[model samples]
Target: RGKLPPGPTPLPLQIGIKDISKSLTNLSKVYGPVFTLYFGLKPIVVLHGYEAVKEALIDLGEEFSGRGIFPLAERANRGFGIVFSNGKKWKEIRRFSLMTLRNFGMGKRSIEDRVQEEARCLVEELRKTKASPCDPTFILGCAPCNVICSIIFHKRFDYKDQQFLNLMEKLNENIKILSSPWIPIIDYFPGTHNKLLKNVAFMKSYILEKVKEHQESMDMNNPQDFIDCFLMKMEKEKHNQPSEFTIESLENTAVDLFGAGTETTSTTLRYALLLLLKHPEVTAKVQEEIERVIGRNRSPCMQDRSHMPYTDAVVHEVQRYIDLLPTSLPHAVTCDIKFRNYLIPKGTTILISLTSVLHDNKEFPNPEMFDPHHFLDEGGNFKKSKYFMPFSAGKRICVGEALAGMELFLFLTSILQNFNLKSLVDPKNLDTTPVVNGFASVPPFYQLCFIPIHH
Candidate 1:
C-alpha cells in the first residue's frame, strides 16, 4: 500500500490553492503524516507532525538537506546566496558562514553586547511615543535591522535616516512580495517576471552600492565588517575559488542576511507585543518576574534570563504560538533514498510543516491555547521541548538562530522593563491570528499604548 504518500493532484480545482500550512495538516488527516503537494507542474513532498519531520530533518539529515528548487528564487538570486545555493558551493559557503560568524561573535558577548546596545536604542525610541497608540512596525524593525547592519556594514543608521529607511522599506516589500501567491504565476509569465525582478534588481543595486563603498575602505589585515571579511577571503582565493566568492555572490549574501535577518525576528517581536496586549495576565506575570528578579533600575541582561524563567518561558511560547515560517524554507532530498517504506526520488522537494510539530497536541497539551506553561514543568522552571522548532532543524537550521533568540529576549525584555503595554481595544478582543500567512506568518498591524513605569 506504499505509494507517493497520498495527496490531492494539481488539477484545475486544486493546483493554485494557498493556505499551504493549513492544507498540509488537513492532508495529513486523510493521507497519514507523509504526503505530496503540487504547485502547478511541480510536486513537493510534505512531511507533517513532529515524528515525520524529525525523521527527515534530523534522523536522515544528509539525504534531506538539499535546498528545494524555487524557480522564482533561482531567477531572482541566481545561485548566488546561502539560502538558495546547494552542492559544494552551498557546503563551502555554509561552512564558511558558520565558522566566520562563530568567530565574529555569533554565540558570544560580542554579539550580545551589540543586541543589548540596539535594545537600548529601541527603548529610547519607544519612550518618545508618550504612551500614544502608535504602530510599532518601523521602530520594531530598527533594532534587528541595525543589528544585521552592524555585522554586515560595521555601522548602524539613525532611525530617522532617509537612506536606511528606503533600504528597509524595500527589504520589507521584498519579503511580502516574494511570499505572495503570484510567485508561481510570475515564474511562467515573462512580463510578470520582469516586474518582480525590478524589486530584486533594486535590492541587489542597493547592496552593491554598499559593497563598492566597503571595497574603498576595506582593511585586509583587519576586516571591518562581513563584507570586508569576505573581500579579504575572496582575495585569498581569487584563483582557486573564483566561482564561489564572486562579487555577485557577495551582494546576494548581503541581501539574504538583510531580508532574512530583519523581517522574521522583527515580525516575531511585533507578534509578541500583540500577544502581550491580548493577554494582560501573561504580561503581568512577566513584569512580576522581572520585578522580582531584577528591579526596574538596571536594564535586564542576557545573563538575567536564567533567573527569570517565566519571562524565558513566555518568549519561548511566543515563538511556538506565532509559528512563523510554518512550512520551513524549502528542502529537498540530495539523492534517491529509502525513507521508512517509501523511495523518495532524487531531487524531490520536501516541505516539513513546523507548525504541525510546534503545535503537536501530544507534546503541547491545549496546543491551540496561548500558555507559557507549555514550556514549563510542574516545578514552574522553564523546560525545553524538542518539538519547539520555530527556527527549524537539521543541517539547514537557521544560521542566525542564536542571534535571533538573543535579540527577541533582550529587545522584548527591554520594552517590558521600561514600559507596560496597553491595547487601545479591549484585551479580550485582540486577534492573535496572522494577517498574512504564506511564506511567513505576518502579525496583524496593531498599535499599542506604551504606558511608562518611570522606574
Candidate 2:
C-alpha cells in the first residue's frame, strides 16, 4: 500500500486547487512524472508528459483502461452510459457504440455528406449577417449540433429552432457548471448543481422522447439512425441473460454520444476562426491554397485535405494550441499493477496530462505561440507529431475523433472558402486565451465580420 509513487501530503481541501493542469504540471516537476495526489482521501495517480502518459495509456492500456469516477459525470450518468460504466458493461456498451457509430456512417463518406450539407447551411446562415459583426457562438453551435442531430435523430433542425437552441444552451451551461471548482461541494448546496441535474433530466427526456418515436416506426430489416440501430440491438439481446441493452442504457448512451459529439468540435471551429482572425496572414495563406486547389466551384472534402497541406497544418495547429480537454477524461487503473517503479493499486484514478504531450517543448518549440509552422516543415508540407494528442491516445481515446476531424476540416475550409474573416478588434490585440480553462479550454467570446468573397 505504501509502495505507490511518492506525492504531496493529502490535504483536506484539495478541491480548492484551481487550474488543475498547471498545478499538476508543477507537481510533476518536483515529484517526477508519475506521482499521486489525494482528492478528498482518494489517491489519483497523475500521468504527466508524453512518456509517462503514453506508457500508461498505450503500452499498458489494459491495466489503465478503466474510467475513473468523475463526480459530475458519475452524478449525471450514474454509471449507466459508455463514459462512466466499468467492467463488462463498459466493454459491451462501448463496443456496441463504436460499431453502431460506424454502421450509422461515422467516419464514412455518408457522414461527410451530412457534414458538408451542414457546412453549406452554416455558410448561408453567416451570409445573412451581411458582413455585420456578429458572435459566431450560436450559429457555430447550430451546425455541429445539427450534424450530430442528423446522425442520432436522422433529421436536422432549422437554425432558428427554439427546441434545438434550448438543448444547446443547456448542454453548454452544464459544461460550465461541471468545470467549476465547487462541483464537489456544490452538490451539497442548492445552486448550479440543481441546474445541472435539471439539464441532465431535460437532455434525457429529449433523447427518450426520440427513442419512443423511433420505437413506433423502427424497421427491423433496416435501421435508420443510431437510435434505430440501438433498438434493433436491444431486440436481439432481449433473450440473452444480463443484457447491456436496456432503456436506461439507451437513454444514457444516446446522451453520452450526443454530448460527446457536440461542443468540442464547435468550440474548436470557433477557436480556429479566432486564431485565423488573430493571424490574417495565416488566413490569406489558407485561402490562397483553397483557391489554387479547391477553387470556388467545389466544396471542401476529405480528398481535398491531402492536397491542401497548409490548410491541414492550420487545423492541426489550432487543436494543438488550444489544448482542449487539457487533462482529458479521468482514467483509472483496472487492476493493481507495477508501472515503472511505482505500484499503483486497482481503481486508483488517473489524470493523463494531455496538455503536456500537446505542448511538449521538445516536439513543439515555443509551444505557447500559435504558429501553424509548428505543424509544417521547412518544405511547407504537413508534419505529423506523435506529441499531437489533442484527442488523446490509447484505448480510451475519443470515439468522435474522426468525426470531429472531418467536421473541423470541412467547416473551417468551407468558411474560409466563402468569406474573408474581419476581426472586430485589432488583429494584433485579439486574445487567443480561453475564457474558461477547466474541464475544457473554452475559447473566449469574440465577434467578427465574415466578408463575403466575390468570385
Candidate 3:
C-alpha cells in the first residue's frame, strides 16, 4: 500500500552490514521492525521483532521463500550452494542436504557419538592445560569441527593436523564476511580492490581435494561421507535422469554443510562454556542434572535431554543471552508477495532478528537477565519459547538445525560432566567478546581454566 514498511528514511538506506550483527537490536530500537536498507544495488527489507518476523516468514511464507545470499557471493560459489542461491537451485541443494544429514543421523546416536568423541578428545587436550589458564578457543573450535569432519570424511583429525589447522583459519576468515561487509564492498569494486577479499582459492581447493578423496575411495557397494553418498546416488542416477548431482554440486553442497554446520555450533559451544565459567551456579545445576540422569558410565547423548530439563534450560538460556547471529541471514522473496501494507518485490531481502526474538521481554520475562526458567514451564518441564529462532523459522530454516541442537545439548552437558569452567581473568575488565562483524558472528578470545569435577 505504501512505498515502504515502517522504519527510518535514510536516502541510500543504511548499508551497515558491518554494524548490523552486533547492533541490529539497536537499529530496530531506533527504527521499527521493517526498515529499508541497500547492499550495493539491492534495496532489501529488514524484519525484526518476533511478531513481525513470524508474520512474514510463517504467516506469509510463500511471499518470502528466497534465501537472501549477498550480492557478490555468486562470483565465489557460482550460486551452487543453498546458503546464497535461489529458485530450483536452492530447493534441490537444500533438500539434498537435509536428506543426507538426517539419514546419516543428525540428532541421533550417530552424530552425538561423534560429537562426544570430539568432546572426549577436547577434554584430553584441556588436560594438557596443567591446571593453568589456557585459551580454550582452539580446543573448543576443534571439537565441533572434528565432529563435522568425522561425519563428512568418516574420519576425525588431531588439533595439530596441518590441513585441519589451515582449513579452520580459512573458515574463520569466511565466517567474517558479513561482520565486516567492507571487504565485500571492495570485492564489488574488484578493479580497485582484490586482496582485501580473500582469494577463496584455499577454500575451493581444499573442499575440492576432499571431494576427490571421497571419489577415490568411493565404494559403489557402500558409500561413506556426504560426498560418497552423493557419488553413489550419482552412479545410480547415471541412467536415471538429469538430477542436480555432480562433482561440482557435490563440492558446493559439501562446502555449504561444512561451513554452515561447523562455525555456528562451535562458536556457540565456546561461548556457552565461557558463560558457564562466568555463571558457576548455572554450571553446577547443569552438571547436577547431567550427573543425576546420564551419569559418567555413558557418554552424553541427545536422548538424555528429556531427563535433564534444567540443563536444557541452561543451554537455551545461554543461546537466548548471546545469540551468535543477531540478524539471521537475509532472505530472498521468491515471488512478488504482499505483506500487511507493502508489495515486497521479488528478490527483496527479508531480514529476521533471531536475537531479538529469542530475547524479547514480553515473551521472555527478565529478558536481559540470564534466567533459564524463561524456557521452562511451572511444571518444571523443559519448555521452548516461541522466540527461540536461533536457526530461523519455516521452510527455509537451516538444514543443520537438528544436528546443531543435539550438539549444543550433548556437548554442553558432557563438558560440564568432566570439568567445571572457570574464568582465567576477571571478564569485567576483559572484553571477553570481540565483535567479529558481518553476516555471521564470532566472540573474541579469552582463556578459561578447566577444573576437573569429581562426583
Candidate 4:
C-alpha cells in the first residue's frame, strides 16, 4: 500500500513517554514486520518481532552495521567511541575496541576474576545493610563500575571515595539527560544543549586529565590498561593525521568504556534484584541451584553457570522480561537498498525494537510474565534462543556484552549464595515497573532486606 515500508503518518510525536517500542510493536501488527516511521524530519525503519530483527541485524549484517546518529549523540559523541559514529573511524575504532577489550580479558576468565573480586566487595558492602531496607542502586552501580573501571582506568575506587561518587553522580546525570525526550531537539534550540554540555563538561576534563597522566608515564613496552593501550595505538597511528586514534578520541573512548559499559550493566543488576524480590519462588530456585552446584562458602565463578541451569535461565529471563534497552541504540544503513521489497534509502535512521524481539509471544509464550522457563528447555537445561539478543546482534553488538553477562551472573549468584533477599514492602505490593522506560528502562527505586544465611 505504501512505496516504502507501510507505517502510520508521522505526527509531531510518534511515541509515548514511557516505552516507545510498545507503540512500534503494535504498528508492526498493522504494517507488518519492517515499517518506516518518522521522528520529525528523520525517517526510521523499525524492525519488529524476532524474525525481522534477526533477518535484518544478522542476515543483512553489513547493511545495518552502521551506527545511526541523533542530535543528542551527535552533539555528545562527536563521532567518537563505539556507540556512535560511522565510516573508517567507526570501523577501525570498533575493531580496535573489541580487540583491546578481549586482549584485556573482557570475554576471558581474567574478566571473571575481576568480577569475582568485585562481587566479594559487593557482598561485604551489602552486609552492612544488616537486614534493613536500603536502596541498592549506588552500591550495585559501583560494583560493575569498578569492574569496567579496572579494565579502562587500571584503578578501582573505594565505595565511599569522593572522586568516584562524583564521577557516578555526573555519569548518572548525563544518562538521565540523554534519556529525556528533549535531548534530540536540544542543540537546535538554544540554552537546552548548554545544560547538558555543562553536565558532561566535568567528565570531559576528568578523562582528558587521565589521558595526560597516561601520556606522561608512557609504557610502550608494557601497557597498563586501556588508556595505556590507546595512547600506544595513537602513537603507532600518528602518521595518519586524520587517524581515529587521537587523544580526544582516547578521552571519548574511555568515557564510552566507563559510561556505556558501567551504567547499563549496573542497571541490569538492579533490575535483576528487583525481579528476584518480586518473585521469591524464582529467587529460591536460583539459590537452590547455587547450593547444589556452587555449595556454601565458595564464590560463584563463570564455570559454575554450566551446572546451574535454573539460575542461568532466571538471569536470561530477567534480561528478556525487563527489556532494559527497549528501542536499541539507533542503527544506520550503509547504502540504499531494497529490504523485503521495501526501498530503504542510504543513511536512513533505523531503530531495532529489542523489546519486540525480547517480548515476542511466539518466541516466548506469555512474554509479559517473568518466567525463567522461557530460557529452559523441556529437559530443564538452559536453552539459548536465537531470538535472545539483549546485547543485540551483528557487527555493532554491545562491545562489553561478554563482560556484562559475566558480571550479572557472578554478582547475582554471589548475593543469593550469601543472603536471602526480602522486600521491605509486601511482595505483592512491590512494583517491578521501571521509573524510566524508553531508551533505557531503569527500575523504580525500592529498598530490600538482605537477611544473611547462616551456613
Pick by TM-score: which candidate is best?
A: 2
Q: Which pairs of residues clash in candidate 3, taking residues 3 or more apart in a chain or in different chains? A: 66-332, 68-332, 178-438, 178-439, 179-437, 179-438, 179-439, 434-444
Best by lDDT: 2
Per-prediction TM-score to the true structure, in the order listed: 0.91, 0.94, 0.88, 0.92
Q: Compared with the true structure, what per-residue lDDT tens digits does model 2 show for residues 288-333?
A: 9999998888888999999988899999999999888888888998
Q: Where is model 4 poorest over a 10-residue stretch in terms of lDDT? A: 181-190
The alpha-carbon RMSD values of the candidates against the true structure, listed in the order shown, are 3.1, 2.5, 3.6, 2.9
Model 4 lDDT per residue over 173-205, tens place: 766666554223331344536766776678879
lDDT of each: 0.80, 0.83, 0.71, 0.79
Cα lDDT tens digits, model 3, 108-158, are: 346656777876787678788877888767677777787777777777888
Candidate 1 residue 7 Cα shift, in angstroms, is 2.7
> Which scores better on TM-score, 1 or 4?
4
TM-score rank, highest first?
A: 2, 4, 1, 3
The candidate, 2 or 4, that scores higher on TM-score is: 2
Query: Could you tell me how far off, in angstroms, the CA of residue 231 lies in candidate 1 after the best superposition?
Result: 1.7
Candidate 1 deviates by what RMSD?
3.1
